[PDB]
Scaffold this motif. Structure first.
Motif, mmCIF file in Angstrom:
data_model
loop_
_atom_site.group_PDB
_atom_site.id
_atom_site.type_symbol
_atom_site.label_atom_id
_atom_site.label_comp_id
_atom_site.label_asym_id
_atom_site.label_seq_id
_atom_site.Cartn_x
_atom_site.Cartn_y
_atom_site.Cartn_z
ATOM 1 N N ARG A 47 -68.080 -14.436 57.852
ATOM 2 C CA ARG A 47 -66.815 -15.753 57.441
ATOM 3 C C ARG A 47 -67.346 -16.977 57.651
ATOM 4 O O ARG A 47 -66.542 -17.943 56.670
ATOM 5 C CB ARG A 47 -65.650 -14.640 58.097
ATOM 6 N N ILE A 63 -53.481 2.811 62.192
ATOM 7 C CA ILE A 63 -54.744 2.650 62.985
ATOM 8 C C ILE A 63 -55.735 4.105 62.055
ATOM 9 O O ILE A 63 -56.469 3.913 62.009
ATOM 10 C CB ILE A 63 -54.563 3.745 64.437
ATOM 11 N N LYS A 64 -54.477 5.264 61.935
ATOM 12 C CA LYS A 64 -55.015 5.974 60.603
ATOM 13 C C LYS A 64 -56.140 5.864 59.720
ATOM 14 O O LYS A 64 -57.038 6.560 59.349
ATOM 15 C CB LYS A 64 -54.020 7.185 60.973
ATOM 16 N N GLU A 95 -63.392 2.827 57.590
ATOM 17 C CA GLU A 95 -64.741 2.976 58.363
ATOM 18 C C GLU A 95 -64.195 1.183 58.444
ATOM 19 O O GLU A 95 -65.534 0.878 58.551
ATOM 20 C CB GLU A 95 -65.690 3.102 57.516
ATOM 21 N N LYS A 96 -63.146 0.611 58.807
ATOM 22 C CA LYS A 96 -62.930 -0.722 59.352
ATOM 23 C C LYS A 96 -63.104 -0.486 60.010
ATOM 24 O O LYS A 96 -61.811 -0.910 61.328
ATOM 25 C CB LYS A 96 -61.590 -1.299 58.909
ATOM 26 N N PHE A 97 -63.934 -0.492 61.319
ATOM 27 C CA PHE A 97 -64.347 -0.302 62.867
ATOM 28 C C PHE A 97 -63.786 -1.208 63.788
ATOM 29 O O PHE A 97 -62.395 -0.555 64.608
ATOM 30 C CB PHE A 97 -65.692 0.019 63.555
ATOM 31 N N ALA A 98 -64.021 -2.258 63.354
ATOM 32 C CA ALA A 98 -63.297 -2.605 64.650
ATOM 33 C C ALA A 98 -62.006 -3.674 64.051
ATOM 34 O O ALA A 98 -61.114 -3.582 65.380
ATOM 35 C CB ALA A 98 -64.293 -4.624 64.737
ATOM 36 N N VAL A 115 -65.211 -14.909 52.088
ATOM 37 C CA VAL A 115 -66.003 -13.967 52.430
ATOM 38 C C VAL A 115 -66.235 -13.183 51.108
ATOM 39 O O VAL A 115 -67.332 -12.701 50.580
ATOM 40 C CB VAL A 115 -65.670 -13.053 53.057
ATOM 41 N N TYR A 166 -50.967 -0.903 69.642
ATOM 42 C CA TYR A 166 -50.660 -0.117 69.883
ATOM 43 C C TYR A 166 -50.212 0.481 71.379
ATOM 44 O O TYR A 166 -48.909 0.350 71.470
ATOM 45 C CB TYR A 166 -51.623 1.634 68.606
ATOM 46 N N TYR A 174 -70.846 -4.636 65.334
ATOM 47 C CA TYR A 174 -70.505 -4.865 63.764
ATOM 48 C C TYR A 174 -69.046 -5.654 63.681
ATOM 49 O O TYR A 174 -68.997 -6.787 62.762
ATOM 50 C CB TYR A 174 -69.467 -3.193 64.184
ATOM 51 N N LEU A 176 -69.646 -9.775 61.498
ATOM 52 C CA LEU A 176 -68.395 -9.543 60.613
ATOM 53 C C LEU A 176 -67.688 -11.115 60.696
ATOM 54 O O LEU A 176 -67.956 -12.042 59.919
ATOM 55 C CB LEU A 176 -67.625 -8.247 60.212
ATOM 56 N N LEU A 206 -59.163 -10.490 57.629
ATOM 57 C CA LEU A 206 -59.851 -11.686 56.518
ATOM 58 C C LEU A 206 -61.447 -11.553 56.982
ATOM 59 O O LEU A 206 -62.201 -11.088 55.856
ATOM 60 C CB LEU A 206 -59.739 -12.896 57.037
ATOM 61 N N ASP A 207 -61.705 -9.975 58.160
ATOM 62 C CA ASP A 207 -63.372 -9.907 58.450
ATOM 63 C C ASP A 207 -63.833 -9.180 57.521
ATOM 64 O O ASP A 207 -65.168 -9.519 56.752
ATOM 65 C CB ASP A 207 -63.648 -9.855 59.900
ATOM 66 N N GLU A 208 -62.698 -8.528 57.214
ATOM 67 C CA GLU A 208 -63.027 -7.675 56.106
ATOM 68 C C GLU A 208 -62.569 -7.699 54.665
ATOM 69 O O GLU A 208 -62.271 -6.103 54.237
ATOM 70 C CB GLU A 208 -62.449 -6.248 56.984
ATOM 71 N N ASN A 209 -62.410 -8.432 54.781
ATOM 72 C CA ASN A 209 -62.406 -8.969 52.596
ATOM 73 C C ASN A 209 -61.068 -8.417 52.199
ATOM 74 O O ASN A 209 -60.655 -7.905 50.901
ATOM 75 C CB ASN A 209 -63.324 -8.881 51.975
ATOM 76 N N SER A 258 -54.951 -10.552 61.747
ATOM 77 C CA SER A 258 -55.422 -11.837 60.803
ATOM 78 C C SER A 258 -56.643 -11.858 60.082
ATOM 79 O O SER A 258 -56.699 -11.166 59.185
ATOM 80 C CB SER A 258 -54.034 -12.152 60.719
ATOM 81 N N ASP A 259 -57.543 -12.028 61.259
ATOM 82 C CA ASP A 259 -58.951 -12.295 61.941
ATOM 83 C C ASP A 259 -59.679 -11.080 61.565
ATOM 84 O O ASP A 259 -60.584 -10.813 60.571
ATOM 85 C CB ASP A 259 -59.286 -13.218 62.877
ATOM 86 N N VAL A 278 -69.590 -0.946 68.139
ATOM 87 C CA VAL A 278 -68.615 -0.923 67.379
ATOM 88 C C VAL A 278 -67.968 -2.520 67.935
ATOM 89 O O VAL A 278 -67.691 -3.311 66.608
ATOM 90 C CB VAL A 278 -67.164 -0.501 67.211
ATOM 91 N N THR A 308 -48.865 3.274 64.195
ATOM 92 C CA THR A 308 -50.262 4.550 64.010
ATOM 93 C C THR A 308 -50.767 4.967 62.585
ATOM 94 O O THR A 308 -51.341 5.396 62.242
ATOM 95 C CB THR A 308 -48.739 5.273 64.426
ATOM 96 N N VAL A 353 -55.556 -0.052 68.122
ATOM 97 C CA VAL A 353 -55.837 0.482 68.873
ATOM 98 C C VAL A 353 -54.855 -0.057 70.456
ATOM 99 O O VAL A 353 -54.058 0.417 70.741
ATOM 100 C CB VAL A 353 -56.802 0.904 68.948
#
Lengths: 171, 171, 171, 171, 171, 171, 171, 171, 171, 171, 171
Positions: free
Chosen positions: J158, G131-132, G138-141, J168, G150, J150, J154, G78-81, G74-75, J147, G128, G147
């Motif tokens: 926040r 993740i894809k 490109e929301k890397f973190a 954010v 998973y 990054y 972020l 939210l970090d990634e809006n 969740s965090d 990563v 799965t 992962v």
């Protein structure tokens, strides 16, 4: 208790001569304990005056352990009712093979380490017997405690040799 | 399983009598363990009833060690297929030279201490013999376990003695 | 000595009988405490001869807790100036419903557990009463300690019941 | 230097031939250390493939102790200036009675456990001899270390046996 | 809000004077809290001036628990919307039995301990009433908090008593 | 099994309807536990959406405690043969007063805080009743448990209120 | 303010419908987070009512990890809006294949374990795809965190299957 | 059981064959896992036989990491239903590049270290391929596992190089 | 012993008057030690009654340090054979500039904070003199101690100041 | 040795010019790491000069994470054989967007916090690129390190946004 | 408000010139503080690029302590109402003697060590002076803090000198 103190010291000192001639564990361990404490002083010197930080650390730590074995084995003795050196006068009297030198603060770190391999080999003659005596006297706890200090000495020897490139064989 | 668990207990009791004669080590430790449990009860009592908060602490701690050594040695024994006393009845059968006393709640602290010094010397008769007997049966782990218990008792005697003002000599 | 100790003891035994008939809190807890210690031995036995090493670690834990409550409640009682069972003798006199058995070393794990569920259900009839008495007597801290024990016993019953695949509701 | 190495190693194979006949302690320990390592693999295997997560974690815990003892004893040997098998070659050469089996991954958890009791019994036949040998040679620290191992193996046999529902006797 | 302070404060003084008469739990814990603080100071004196390093340590520790209970119970009170004394003035007004003395630096350790045995009993007369009142008012959590403090005082009494070699009986 | 499982549920619904009416302790706590879990969800939402990092952390800590208390108290009910709600459906059935709002993510931090003061005051209406019913029914350990919960709630109310800059009077 | 809250939430609703056929990563994680929370309720139930005490502790442990991950992710969202489900309402709406059953308190331990092996496999269809999508956007973190979940899910399927005697393949 | 087993193994060696030609991740990691175990033996050898006791600690640390990655990566594989090398047999078949040598016990410390820089650069060839394969196969958690090992090797190489007084370029 | 107590106190009072003239160091620290204790009480009031939970935590911690220094400097004075105030009466006699106020419990948090900023500035007037005098008298360790307390105060001042959004200059 | 160095420096300066103009990941991570260090100075400033104690603590901790990331990423690069800026000279050349200001001491806490939101958003513009570039060069470990960095950034954005009362989004 | 910042900085600039002239404690610590930060950078460089892993570890710990002293002294200064350099620009302006070199990545470990031995003796010229100026100004805590930095540098110089096989007197 004034009058009776000098008489308890003169009867301890009488039993000091009678026990070194028929070897008791107790009397043997007099040399071993005196050796620990005088090693502790040399290692102190060398922990202070050696050049590499890493080796000052290691020698200080061996110093600590000589003192830990001093107390551990003293307690093990007095538990079994024997007596124990406890002053600079006595340590200097019963101390065999180990020798201090004020000049050592200028030795090289190699020559310091090497003297400690010889010392610990020497310490091991007396510990070796003490074990044999203690088993014969049926002092079981004192025995095992001294086996430990035998093991520790070997381990120090090989670590100091290894630090100079050499093997236990080389000595 | 009701009449073939009585078959098993009868054949452990034929075994138990045959072992006390040529003393096995497992038989001898039947006495050391039974002494440990009963001594734990006495220490519990003194741990509650003595006056000094400090001595109540130390004694409750010795009680705890007796139970530790009960368990440790009981483990070493079952490890080497032997049998161990596991009840109040059994503990009473094999215990020796230790005597409880409901009147001990009103002894003075020192009278309590002294009583544990004698109890602990007495414990050491049966222990010294179990060491010898276990080295002979080539139970090496048991031996070292029982050497530890022996060495502890010596510790506990010289502490109780010092806390009364007296050398181990005195007893 | 002797004289002052025999009057204190005969006055305790007198006072003990009186207290047992009306019940006091401290009298009732003499049964709880005695039960604690005999269970300790029973759980010590099972902690040794049970096969599954998981059930052994667990049962030995329950032993240590029963001794823990022994000291905790004793202390709470002495704090409120009562007297406490403190020898094997008094433990056997005052313990009810819990019964040792040297043939338990050959019982099965399922059966040892089942004997402890019953044992602990039995300890609760007496604890229950000691809670209620303690509150009447306004021994408030003691009351709190004994509530803890009540809840710990209920938990053990349901853990042992679960470990045999059973609901508590079965028992 | 590639040729001085070859010399040292010719010497080692000579000295080792003599030592396995007249059995020294080092050479008996060669089988013990080699057994430790191969057991490590077996236990690594079984800690991965056994189904029960509880048995897996226990099986890896024992795996790590083999390695721990392997290092422990090796340090003790080298301290007393002996030599140790350090390659897969020498392990397979000197290993006794323990046999690996790629199809063990499809064995049942019971059969895996079963197979280690038998392996650990086997390991003991040699450890026994090496304690006895090491005492003979006056290699005291080494001897103590190997008794620890003897003990541990006995502990393991019993726990594995208990987990299967059985006694030490059964085997 | 300067005059809204002054009139908030006359309303505290009206509700508080009405509340001591019937006593509320709050009212009565004013005394209990005021005694903890003044006791804290007595023990601060004792922990600095007593001779025995051990007794200093033990007294300083009791002072600390006196202040932990002050915050714990004040917090339990403010949680149920009661008010708490919080000045020197108020602790002086509300405290009973516990008298300070600049001269106690000159007493004997035994004499100090004995003053505290009397203070702690004295404290208990009010605490006891605060428990009942708190339960009657259905302040459940406050109640259990104050019960715990009752239990602590008993414990300290008996340890102090035991350190002078007496039983609690005596007092 | 499929018809002993379906008529085990039909009798659970029979027993639980009868119990809601003569409010048993177990059925009151059914609202208590359902309230805890639904509060847990609200605190989770606020713990994520609140702006203040400090508040997010505090709110998450309270969510953790609500869960801890859901387990502690569920365990005490089961120990004592009661039953416990355990599904969404059931929490949504028995939950009173606390209302979720997905729009709360758009609230100000102060309004969120305010909504928990009111929520927690409301949980106490039922917690209060459950204590009384638990003492009545002589479920002692349970009762103690729910007393802690009551205390906790009271302390959360006071800190939330303070963070808003108000004493609890205002609420 | 009540009006803008309403306006913002209308926009939120527009944005979620659009985002659910696009499927974005946030929308898919909508299903994952809802699944986590409901699984939590399921593990909580099973951790209370399952018979084996070892399994209860293990199920509780997994319940905690579901929640930790619910917050962790969740965090990360939210970090990634992105937006996150925060109410029972939204969890019911968005979860898939996990169903609760008031009747599961009466299931057998094996039947609970199996039901969780199917629930975690169901959970992995969504993880799965998330993740894809997380890598696509490109929301890397965010992606690294998912992962982990998973992987944890796989660990857990293998452990539950090991406990039931089986292999993952059987499943 | 004994033929259920023997053609479970037949279908394994048959499916292992097909799997090493279109090289699957699992197949490739067989080489990586085998390498880890042999390297472990080498680092053992060097950790006992090296002369510098600082380097002996370090090389034991690396032996221990190598074993942890063996279990970590094995666990990850089995979580994803893949099979894993389990015996000295298979470790010798699949291992490439790393060669053991009993004469290593007489090499200089510097030659020991260089042998490991090259060993680890060689391990990395198969690890690198294992990552790519694991991402094609969408075994996400297994990939991250393998990236960690990759990064660990690189660090070891640079530290090893560093202790030789060389930067990483020089290899 | 009662008339002697009274005589020592008369000499104490005699000496104390002389010493407050020239000031001695110890006499100065009479004021410092009194300010510490009285401040501990103020800080206890604010620690209970401030609104913000974070400010309550911080003020409680400042109170604890006030006490810790009170012990630490009192020890340092007794070591150097000076005497130390230790009752409410003396604290009130020697305290300067700090004034308690029952009204404070209604102040705003910001006004409590401001009053502590002024208090601590005042505290320092006497700490300054005390350091300089301790230096004249060559009470080396007492001097290093009081510098510590001086630094603590300047730190407390800047922190309270900063919490109000103001620089230390502003005061 | 003073000429071997200058040619090595010049081949560095030449390599770097090609690398920045194509970008490599190493070259891009030149900006990232210069940005980390300058930020660390900016946060160091703000951590010293902000008014609120709580915010000073937090900024000092962000500063310390910036440095941890500096070593972590430098190591990951050197491990993979790249070069890293390591002087004020160099960070000033390569640093973009982050701008130091000695008049920042006088800013508002709110203003400092807004300045770091904007800086951290700007850091990410480069970090993003370093991630893509490191995956492309198949530097797998390095990619995963960056990563993390990054994700941290972020999270920090926040948390600062939250501490100003904003989402954010507002950003 | 943008304008007030400019005026306050204008006054800062005036006063900085006045204070560097007649030198205050504070301004002298401008050089000390700036030297810590530049050294930190030098040590970072050297702790990344040095060859020996042991020396890298050690040099980073020194970088760490430099930073810690920068906070510790900056906090002491501000408590005492002084100002502190907090940008690259200022650090560059006020640092004397230390100078960075990008070519130092290609120095030998020895050259790196000697350069820190010189840098650290240069650092002490200013530290020495700040100590005296702080004692002169009655900034008692600052002084003590700075004496502690002095001590550290001297301890660093001897350790570096020892690692080069040299005595400190050499330097």
């Amino acid at each position: 208790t004034k009058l009776m103190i000098d008489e308890k010291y003169a009867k301890e000192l009488d039993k000091a001569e009678i026990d070194h001639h028929k070897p008791t564990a107790g009397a043997m361990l007099g040399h071993v304990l005196s050796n620990l404490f005088i090693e502790n002083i040399r290692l102190t010197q060398a922990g202070i005056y050696a050049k590499s930080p890493v080796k000052c650390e290691y020698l200080r730590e061996i110093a600590q352990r000589e003192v830990e074995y001093f107390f551990k084995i003293s307690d093990l003795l007095l538990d079994e009712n024997e007596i124990v050196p406890s002053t600079t006068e006595e340590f200097l009297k019963y101390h065999k093979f180990i020798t201090e030198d004020p000049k050592a603060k200028y030795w090289t770190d190699e020559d310091l380490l090497e003297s400690f391999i010889v010392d610990f080999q020497a310490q091991n003659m007396f510990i070796t017997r003490a074990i044999k005596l203690a088993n014969k006297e049926e002092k079981f706890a004192l025995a095992a405690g001294v086996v430990e200090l035998y093991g520790y000495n070997l381990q120090v020897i090989r670590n100091l040799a290894g630090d100079l490139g050499k093997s236990v064989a080389d000595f």
